[PDB]
Design a protein around this ligand. Structure first.
Ligand SMILES: CCCCC/C=C/C/C=C/C/C=C/C/C=C/CCCC(=O)OC[C@H](COP(=O)(O)O[C@H]1[C@H](O)[C@H](O)[C@H](OP(=O)(O)O)[C@@H](OP(=O)(O)O)[C@@H]1O)OC(=O)CCCCCCCCCCCCCCCCC
Ligand SMILES: CC[C@H]1O[C@]2(CC[C@@H]1C)C[C@@H]1C[C@@H](C/C=C(\C)C[C@@H](C)/C=C/C=C3\CO[C@@H]4/C(=N\O)C(C)=C[C@@H](C(=O)O1)[C@]34O)O2
Length: 1334
């Protein structure tokens, strides 16, 4: 709790000053002397120890204006159309949002803007803080900032005026001390100063400001977010205030900073603002709606708006009186702020007796009265004097140079990495493990020509493993964007400085990754062993990773989520991967494709690495074309190697010749490519910095008796509820009230059987005098506090779903629909019945969402109770009053309601019928009728001895004060003892006994349908959930279109890079790697898909799981079935976009089997596109976060791809890894695909693959080579030289057999893949049961 600038804070500041004066070395300012006052010390410290520069930085600002006037101006099947319309709107009236006003705010005054939502307070505070982005300002207006101008403030005085409204953006894993010290050190001036180190001064600044705002205790504690634990809810707002004050802000504007915050938290926040205004001369503006009287007693000035009209402005204490002079009536026990706010509501409010004709009803009449009043005349006189006085009388807003900003950014980034080493450790160790595994695949490559291909493959993947190694770093960019924006607004540092700091801070991680991967890969794979070759390889890999890191940062500087950046960048990254130079060697490159390789930053890296390895090297020949049983005694001059650069009669193959023939790489480009890659890195770094700088912007009565409830905590059991008894009757509302530690929520959850812990010892809950049965949990509705709804379901659809799945199965659909309509009418939801729920920003209000939740829990027809968990909490005064009226209407119709109420207003409290009050230890203190204006309750606490309640006061707070639960109060008597020793308790016990003895004889109603766990059969639940998920996926905003575009673009690029392809010895390998690259969109698809699984899982587990709507099996089966249709359609599109451009059907013409092979390939592609979804869901079933599931799925996919039989077959793989070659799901898909697409067709060798053979003297190639052609496949062509050209392949079956793919085993492989899909589904279900189902 915060008490302001109390004596304790003064003593703490005294101790801090005493500590600091020793390092540093009027009667005040002496820590060791008497009568020293902390306020004067803090005030003078800023002006004295900060020195005086030659600029005109002001220490206080006040704002005055005279005539301020401000004016202004789905289903995917239609989305594209809408976009087109939007485009037309981009191809090519005048209403005042804020009418004329007059105001003046001076330093040291806390000002509050009041008004109902939509009045225009947010726009006024945006205008004051110079944030007019979305509306214009009238030319007649005149705004003066203590003599400056709005343009002057915006241009080179920013940071003096700040505007933060609702959500605080802090680094969750940075401690409060570090968070404040960062700003303190970034704001201190480096221009000399005093004989004190700057770091010491920043530390003293941070300590003093922590002490001032009561945060000294919360040092070295993570600030945290709504997810990460830390400073709970109110110390974070004070941290934000302290940080804003440290940055020199002099006019701080807040809009509903205390939104969804209880009265105590808002009161302490406003207290912190008041001390900020008092100690440090400041002009804070606050826009609040639910403000307590104690909080309102702190405000210095109030301005009240009526639809942006500013009916009144002036001293807060004189506000009510003025309006009471107007002719309005203020009901007693009503806070002044609520009275002022409701005076603008025609439905509420009422005039004084005899004033029914003099008060105004229109905002225009309100302005007329305001202007005619003498208060407006005095205000105008003051404004004129202020403007006359102001008229009579820094290059950049930042304080430290660019180098200092980037240095501090680097330090903060290191602190963040220390506070969360997850991503760096994961990246480093993933690189290490992947390098180890991949090297195990390529272990100890031979020195003969037979290793050529493998060597190339290695130097390809190494490049890839350096290109994408730094993909995860961009995640940090998505976490620091809001904070960087805020600090730019605060005028602390530029986004460019933060970008450079982020680049510099990740160098250690990049070095660790590069070392851990390369030092193992380059050496366990038998590459060139010379030191110079290794060092050149390492240098090129370093530059490749820098280039790709800068490219990834550039892509992620204009994106908000990993999937959002991944979807459009997937095509680009796949294009760079394909055109590296290995999948499609330059000789095989098509006409339209070469320009892609010319501008590829990775092609040059690959060329340099291959040139470095192969140039100036001789490889021993492995195979000679003429060989076998008939050529066991043939001369070496009549033979020739089978490589590309082979020369007849030579026993060795030159690396230079092979490189110049197969890949067309030359040694002249070894060092030039390094310069090209350096240029690419610099270019991408410049683009990234520019982007991050510029591109930014009933009949049964339920009663409990002797309910005792205890829970074991750390081997110790403490009773949370001690002998709590009561009842709930139809037609009455009972309010469950208590302190924070009174455990009223525990009582509510124990009564409703929604608490999974503890044991009830002496309790007894009964209905109509009978013990509880198995039908209880289905006869009580539970309206949770938080509203968890699907964003893609209309109100009517949600109500219909609940009614269908929760009402009796013997009731026809017509009755269910009619009851849904009746509930919609009763809750006054008919105006927006067919409106998407959407998100909080766009969609339904908080009131509408709460009404929808009550309706959802009402259409189930609960016949016993409606437990409401804090309905009037986190809501405005008027919205809370409306919801209370709705609850009263429900209770009128014949309902029984029990609700827990937290910090209510007097008017709200007067609406309830009965009250159950609990004090520490769950001890009942009162249980009885509230009476009129809570009078009866008061009598109970007044006739037993206590301080009489004031005539004007809130009885809700009076109760807490009386029982000692309020902060700063004395009980003076244990009220449990008097309650147990009262006549009221005896009456309650007698009533409970009478009810138990009487109602137990009533004839109960028996029906087995009510005893079932679920009201609908399993198949119906499965169907309904599957349909809901399908509709949600369809209606998501750009989810199906993103998938379609990604898959279509990737498939088209992969199928047209390999346009109709010659079946030469190299073309077959190119097509095999085309099949291999066809699987790359797996990661992007999983990343896109997982969040929409998270949404449904959250909605189910938070609300639908305990409500017993549908079982876990129905949920998981629906999730599994929802993705099959979309995946099948996308797979069909992908197959049509890839199979035909590749021209594979030509291979089927010779054997006449065109249709079967095309059909089988379509099945295989669709099966892969279903398997990707099944595997993503399997990896997501047991995991908690979407990022972890996506990363695990990517790891498993990479492992499956490594041992899929393309990089190295079973005969090359180590015996240890064969277990992964057989259990792979892709080792069969790839075999089936290759077999279907390539089998049973001829092969024609390219001009560069023909191998020259010189027959022995006196022989022709026919006679000399037919025995070999018979022994092994191939063909030969005569030449006009005496030699002849031999091609080692005559049919594609030879290549397929080499890859270990057979034509007769395609259907078996398809069946095995289907079996793997089934295993994935089964494991998904089982793991979801094991991990998530309680
Ligand atoms: C913030 C970013 C941080 C990034 C990190 C910063 C890194 C900055 C480093 C700067 C250092 C730059 C050094 C470059 C100067 C090279 C001067 C000689 C160039 C040369 O000498 O290169 C041809 C010969 C052999 O190459 P080669 O196979 O082609 O054989 C040739 C023959 O030797 C002969 O000399 C004829 O050459 P020329 O006719 O003159 O062209 C021809 O003869 P033939 O082949 O025709 O028979 C052939 O080219 O290189 C060889 O020995 C081995 C290959 C170079 C060996 C140096 C490797 C240096 C690694 C740098 C450090 C890496 C660590 C990375 C980070 C560390 C910690 C984080
Ligand atoms: C989660 C595991 C590790 O994952 C990354 C970053 C670091 C982690 C520890 C990143 C992966 C590649 C991976 C290391 C390299 C390989 C496994 C080699 C190769 C088989 C993988 C290529 C992957 C891709 C090619 O390019 C695709 C793409 N668009 O085409 C996008 C948007 C992302 C790529 C990707 O996400 O690659 C991609 O899926 O290192």
């Amino acid at each position: 709790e915060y008490h302001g600038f109390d004596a304790h804070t003064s003593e703490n500041i005294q101790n801090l000053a005493r500590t600091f004066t020793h390092d540093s070395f009027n009667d005040q300012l002496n820590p060791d002397s008497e009568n020293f006052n902390a306020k004067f010390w803090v005030k003078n410290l800023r002006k004295l120890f900060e020195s005086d520069p030659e600029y005109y930085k002001p220490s206080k600002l006040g704002i005055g204006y005279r005539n301020l006037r401000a004016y202004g101006v789905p289903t995917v099947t239609n989305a594209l159309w809408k976009l087109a319309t939007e485009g037309f709107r981009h191809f090519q009236r005048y209403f005042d949002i804020l009418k004329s006003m007059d105001a003046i705010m001076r330093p040291g005054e806390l000002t509050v803007v009041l008004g109902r939502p939509g009045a225009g307070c947010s726009t006024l505070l945006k205008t004051i803080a110079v944030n007019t982005y979305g509306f214009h300002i009238g030319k007649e207006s005149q705004i003066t900032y203590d003599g400056l101008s709005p343009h002057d403030i915006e241009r080179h005085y920013r940071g003096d005026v700040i505007y933060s409204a609702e959500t605080d953006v802090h680094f969750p894993h940075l401690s409060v001390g570090d968070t404040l010290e960062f700003a303190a050190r970034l704001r201190t001036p480096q221009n000399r100063g005093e004989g004190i180190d700057r770091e010491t001064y920043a530390k003293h600044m941070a300590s003093v400001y922590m002490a001032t705002y009561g945060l000294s205790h919360t040092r070295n504690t993570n600030v945290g977010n709504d997810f990460v634990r830390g400073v709970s809810g109110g110390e974070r707002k004070r941290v934000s205030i302290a940080e804003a004050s440290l940055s020199g802000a002099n006019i701080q504007c807040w809009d509903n900073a205390t939104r969804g915050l209880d009265s105590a938290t808002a009161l302490e926040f406003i207290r912190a603002l008041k001390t900020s205004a008092v100690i440090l001369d400041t002009t804070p503006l606050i826009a609040i709606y639910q403000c307590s009287q104690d909080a309102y007693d702190l405000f210095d000035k109030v301005v009240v708006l009526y639809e942006g009209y500013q009916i009144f402005f002036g001293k807060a204490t004189k506000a009510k009186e003025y309006f009471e002079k107007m002719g309005w009536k203020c009901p007693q026990r009503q806070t002044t702020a609520d009275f002022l706010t409701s005076l603008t509501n025609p439905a509420e409010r009422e005039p004084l007796p005899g004033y029914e004709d003099k008060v105004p009803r229109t905002a225009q009449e309100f302005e007329t009265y305001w202007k005619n009043s003498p208060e407006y005349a005095e205000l105008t006189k003051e404004i004129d004097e202020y403007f006359v006085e102001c008229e009579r009388s820094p290059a950049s807003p930042y304080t430290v140079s660019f180098f200092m900003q980037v240095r501090y950014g680097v330090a903060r980034n290191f602190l963040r990495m220390k506070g969360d080493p997850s991503i760096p450790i994961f990246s480093v160790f993933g690189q290490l493990v992947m390098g180890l595994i991949l090297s195990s695949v390529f272990y100890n490559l031979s020195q003969t020509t037979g290793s050529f291909y493998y060597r190339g493959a290695a130097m390809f993947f190494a490049v890839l493993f350096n290109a994408f190694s730094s993909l995860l770093e961009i995640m940090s960019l998505f976490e620091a964007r809001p904070i960087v924006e805020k600090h730019k607004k605060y005028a602390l540092y530029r986004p460019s400085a933060d970008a450079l700091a982020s680049i510099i801070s990740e160098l250690p991680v990049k070095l660790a990754m590069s070392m851990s991967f390369n030092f193992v890969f380059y050496f366990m794979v038998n590459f060139r062993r010379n030191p110079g070759r290794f060092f050149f390889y390492w240098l090129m890999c370093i530059w490749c990773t820098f280039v790709m890191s800068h490219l990834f940062r550039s892509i992620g500087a204009v994106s908000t989520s990993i999937s959002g950046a991944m979807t459009p960048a997937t095509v680009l990254l796949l294009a760079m991967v394909i055109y590296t130079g290995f999948v499609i060697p330059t000789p095989s490159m098509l006409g339209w494709s070469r320009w892609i390789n010319y501008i590829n930053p990775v092609g040059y890296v690959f060329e340099s690495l291959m040139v470095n390895e192969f140039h100036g090297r001789e490889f021993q020949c492995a195979q000679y074309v003429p060989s076998g049983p008939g050529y066991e005694n043939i001369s070496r001059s009549n033979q020739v190697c089978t490589a590309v650069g082979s020369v007849p009669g030579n026993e060795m193959v030159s690396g230079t010749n092979y490189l110049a023939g197969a890949y067309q790489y030359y040694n002249s480009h070894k060092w030039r490519n390094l310069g090209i890659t350096i240029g690419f890195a610099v270019f991408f770094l410049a683009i990234y910095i520019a982007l991050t700088e510029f591109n930014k912007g009933n009949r049964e009565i339920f009663f409990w008796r002797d309910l005792t409830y205890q829970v074991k905590i750390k081997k110790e059991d403490r009773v949370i509820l001690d002998h709590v008894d009561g009842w709930v009757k139809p037609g009455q509302i009972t309010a469950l009230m208590g302190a924070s530690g009174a455990g009223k929520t525990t009582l509510l959850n124990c009564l409703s059987e929604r608490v999974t812990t503890g044991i009830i010892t002496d309790g007894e809950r009964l209905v109509n005098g009978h013990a509880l049965d198995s039908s209880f949990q289905r006869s009580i509705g539970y309206v949770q506090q938080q509203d968890v709804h699907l964003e893609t379901t209309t109100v009517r659809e949600a109500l219909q779903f609940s009614a269908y799945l929760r009402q009796s199965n013997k009731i026809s659909k017509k009755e269910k629909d009619d009851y849904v309509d009746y509930v919609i009418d009763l809750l006054e939801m008919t105006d927006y019945a067919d409106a998407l729920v959407g998100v909080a920003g766009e969609g339904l209000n908080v009131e509408q969402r709460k009404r929808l939740t009550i309706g959802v829990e009402l259409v189930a027809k609960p016949k016993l109770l409606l437990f409401l968990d804090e309905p009037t909490s986190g809501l405005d005064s008027q919205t809370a009053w409306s919801i209370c009226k709705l609850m009263r209407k429900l209770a009128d119709h014949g309902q029984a309601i029990l609700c827990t109420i937290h910090q209510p207003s007097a008017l709200i409290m007067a609406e309830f019928d009965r009250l159950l009050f609990l004090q520490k230890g769950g001890r009942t203190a009162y249980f009885g009728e509230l009476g009129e204006n809570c009078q009866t309750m008061i009598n109970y606490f007044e006739k037993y001895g206590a301080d009489p309640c004031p005539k004007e006061a809130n009885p809700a707070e009076w109760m807490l004060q009386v029982v000692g639960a309020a902060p700063g109060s004395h009980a003076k008597q244990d009220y449990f003892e008097v309650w147990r020793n009262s006549s009221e308790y005896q009456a309650v016990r007698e009533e409970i006994n009478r009810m138990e003895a009487e109602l137990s004889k009533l004839p109960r109603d028996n029906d087995p349908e009510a005893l079932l766990k679920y009201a609908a059969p399993l198949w119906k639940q499965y169907l309904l959930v599957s349909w809901r998920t399908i509709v949600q996926d369809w209606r998501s905003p750009g989810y199906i279109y993103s998938k379609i575009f990604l898959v279509v673009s990737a498939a088209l690029f992969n199928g047209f890079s390999f346009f109709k392809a010659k079946n030469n010895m190299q073309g077959l390998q190119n097509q095999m790697f085309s099949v291999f690259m066809f699987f790359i969109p797996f990661n992007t698809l999983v990343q896109q898909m997982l969040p929409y699984f998270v949404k449904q899982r959250d909605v189910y587990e938070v609300r639908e799981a305990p409500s017993r709507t549908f079982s876990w099996f129905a949920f998981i089966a629906g999730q599994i079935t929802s993705e099959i249709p979309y995946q099948v359609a996308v797979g069909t599109i992908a197959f049509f976009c890839w199979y035909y451009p590749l021209g594979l059907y030509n291979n089927a013409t010779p054997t006449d089997s065109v249709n079967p092979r095309g059909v089988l390939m379509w099945m295989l592609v669709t099966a892969f596109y279903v398997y990707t979804a099944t595997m993503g869901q399997l990896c997501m079933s047991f995991s908690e976060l979407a990022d972890n599931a996506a990363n695990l799925a990517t790891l498993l996919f990479t492992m499956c791809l490594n041992f899929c039989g393309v990089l190295a077959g079973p005969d090359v793989l180590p015996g240890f890894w064969i277990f992964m070659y057989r259990c792979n799901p892709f080792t069969y898909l790839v075999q089936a695909m290759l077999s279907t697409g390539l089998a049973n067709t001829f092969v024609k060798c390219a001009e560069r693959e023909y191998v020259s053979v010189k027959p022995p003297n006196g022989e022709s190639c026919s006679t000399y080579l037919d025995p070999y052609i018979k022994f092994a496949g191939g063909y030969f062509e005569t030449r006009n030289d005496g030699s002849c050209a031999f091609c080692q392949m005559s049919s594609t079956n030879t290549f397929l057999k080499s890859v270990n793919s057979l034509y007769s085993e395609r259907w078996r492989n398809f069946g095995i893949f289907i079996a793997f899909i089934a295993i994935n589904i089964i494991l998904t279900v089982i793991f979801y049961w094991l991990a998530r189902v309680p």
